[PDB]
Design an enzyme around this catalytic site. Structure first.
Site, short mmCIF file in Angstrom:
data_model
loop_
_atom_site.label_atom_id
_atom_site.label_comp_id
_atom_site.label_asym_id
_atom_site.label_seq_id
_atom_site.Cartn_x
_atom_site.Cartn_y
_atom_site.Cartn_z
N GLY A 51 21.78 -11.73 39.18
CA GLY A 51 22.89 -13.09 39.08
C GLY A 51 23.18 -13.08 37.37
O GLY A 51 24.04 -13.90 36.89
N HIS A 80 31.54 -4.01 37.33
CA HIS A 80 30.90 -3.75 38.68
C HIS A 80 31.29 -5.21 39.56
O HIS A 80 30.30 -4.48 40.69
CB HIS A 80 29.47 -3.17 38.00
CG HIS A 80 28.91 -4.22 37.58
ND1 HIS A 80 28.15 -5.17 38.90
CD2 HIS A 80 27.59 -4.48 36.97
CE1 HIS A 80 27.12 -6.33 37.53
NE2 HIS A 80 27.31 -5.56 36.68
N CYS A 105 23.86 -10.50 35.22
CA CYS A 105 25.73 -10.12 34.72
C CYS A 105 26.03 -10.91 34.07
O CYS A 105 26.79 -11.98 34.81
CB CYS A 105 25.09 -9.31 35.22
SG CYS A 105 23.96 -7.80 36.10
#
Ligand SMILES: O=C(N[C@@H](C(=O)Nc1cncc2ccccc12)c1cccc(Cl)c1)[C@@H]1CC[C@H](C(=O)N2CCCC2)O1
Ligand SMILES: [Cl-]
Lengths: 305, 305
Positions: A143, A41, A145
């Site tokens: 942030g 993503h 991820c």
């Protein structure tokens, strides 16, 4: 003596964390050998989030669109591919800090350490469990991820989780290191919800054996139960069914303490009925389910108090 | 979202752990520059630990009696000295992995990360607090002596604790890195007991603010209290007195949530007098006191190292 929620030392994983930037999006990557693994993503647009076609978005990207930063050094991306929900960026430099490692897919109830990162910089380490509903109750902000879950049994790091998203209830969803999600989740901003969660029965039993090893027996009783009668009671308190596999797995702790698994199941049934009555077990007023039978044997002594 | 007991990343400290052997005793040492720091009781056998004159025991030792192992490499001891309850072994090699560091003495209520080691090998990392009675509720087995406590400020490691012993209640005692014990303890086998412990009030208040930030407000009320009236209530429940310094320190969290510190004190007062009533706060049925106001701000902001 003592019983803490203990995480693995994070040093072997800290040396693998990098920052991955694509357009305006920045998240964390895991640099192993000459490959950087991160959530796919990272290629999405703030519009694309509802129904992204990742294959269509990736074909438009070139190597120089992906900015990879390892500390204060820019790594050069020389190739890219997608495997399920993970993006694999081939880089021109092998990570000299690459530990001995394996990619492992875990089952619900299993525990692991999370190294939470922001901008490729580790900020904290905590211990958690894959819930029966495939979510994790982590501590993550925007942030995070690309932050990873791992176990370090002996000198080998087994990577089992990569963080992808937060669900509306505050819980977290992610994939194994091959990009396969845990649970019925998708990397889309479509209405998704965690299923009803349950208590990991085999882990609560392991924790009751840890309490006995540390010298606490107030909760034991003179009763036993059949496995079926225990499950008929456990289900009414939102506890996962206890299988014969779980009973076999509790064998070593049962032999060490001298308390049969089905006798410990009878103490658990009684605890669920009575509550704690102002008492604690290992410094807790709730029944703890985020320590596996293996974690108890690893942390606790081999001699019962 | 989420709130976990989070430790600092342990990598900078893992690169400093060594194994120290003297006679039949093996424990952990901290290798910084060309010095290895470890508990001085490494020079004591089962007879020497009863009434130990450490200067008399040390004068009989030579450099080659101390075996120091860093991974699979033997370090050469070229000198030795004692500073309070810590032994300093001068080695022939400076640790190339030495981080930027300071030795700091912490106050009760402050938190730190513990890297638990056995045979100079890190096995786990957990977060804990220096209790008001100067003990720590750690998780340690035989061979854990010499394991260290630390905090990280930007890129600087502040070493604050070195493990020495376990007390009869299962709690732990140790020194700062200059060998001064926390609490009224001595390093020898004798009748020693932890004093009556109290709850770290400023930390419980910080944790209540963390619960509000995470969307848990059932415990809030419209009421306020004076610091004098709260301190009378707190003294009745074995809670540490709350000072004006603590109130000032909670200022940022009070401004962020919109709940005045004395407003949050009236919530804590009602929780002490009436209990939780079957409810939980941040997944806990007890009032948690091992998160400082700084830990809450750091975890609810994402500060990295
Ligand atoms: O929520 C966001 N991102 C993800 C997410 O859930 N991130 C987070 C993870 N853990 C804890 C969090 C706590 C608070 C807020 C966010 C958290 C997310 C959302 C939906 C689907 C996926 Cl696969 C991932 C925002 C909004 C879109 C933006 C983003 O990821 N962009 C991609 C490229 C264009 C912008 O960041
Ligand atoms: Cl598993």
């Amino acid at each position: 003596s003592g019983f803490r929620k203990m995480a693995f030392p994070s040093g072997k994983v800290e040396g693998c964390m990098v920052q991955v930037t694509c357009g305006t999006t920045t998240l964390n990557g895991l640099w192993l050998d000459d490959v950087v693994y991160c959530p796919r993503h990272v290629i999405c647009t703030s519009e694309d989030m509802l129904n992204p076609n990742y294959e269509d978005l990736l074909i438009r990207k070139s190597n120089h669109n992906f900015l990879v930063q390892a500390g204060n050094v820019q790594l050069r991306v020389i190739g890219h591919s997608m495997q399920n929900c993970v993006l694999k960026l081939k880089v021109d430099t092998a990570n000299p800090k690459t530990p001995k490692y394996k990619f492992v897919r875990i089952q619900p109830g299993q525990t692991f350490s999370v190294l939470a990162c922001y901008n490729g910089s580790p900020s904290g380490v905590y211990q958690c469990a894959m819930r029966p509903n495939f979510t994790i109750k982590g501590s993550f902000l925007n942030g995070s991820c690309g932050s990873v879950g791992f176990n370090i049994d002996y000198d080998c790091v087994s990577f089992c989780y990569m963080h992808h998203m937060e669900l509306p209830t505050g819980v977290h969803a992610g994939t194994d290191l091959e990009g396969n999600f845990y649970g019925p989740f998708v990397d889309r901003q479509t209405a998704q919800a965690a299923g009803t969660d349950t208590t990991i029965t085999v882990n609560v039993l392991a924790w009751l054996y840890a309490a006995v090893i540390n010298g606490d027996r107030w909760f034991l009783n003179r009763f036993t139960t059949t496995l079926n009668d225990f499950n008929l009671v456990a289900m009414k308190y939102n506890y996962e069914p206890l299988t014969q596999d779980h009973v076999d797995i509790l064998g070593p702790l049962s032999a060490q303490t001298g308390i049969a698994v089905l006798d410990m199941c009878a103490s658990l049934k009684e605890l669920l009925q009575n509550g704690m009555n102002g008492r604690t077990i290992l410094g807790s007023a709730l029944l703890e389910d985020e320590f596996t039978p293996f974690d108890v044997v690893r942390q606790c002594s081999g001699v019962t108090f």
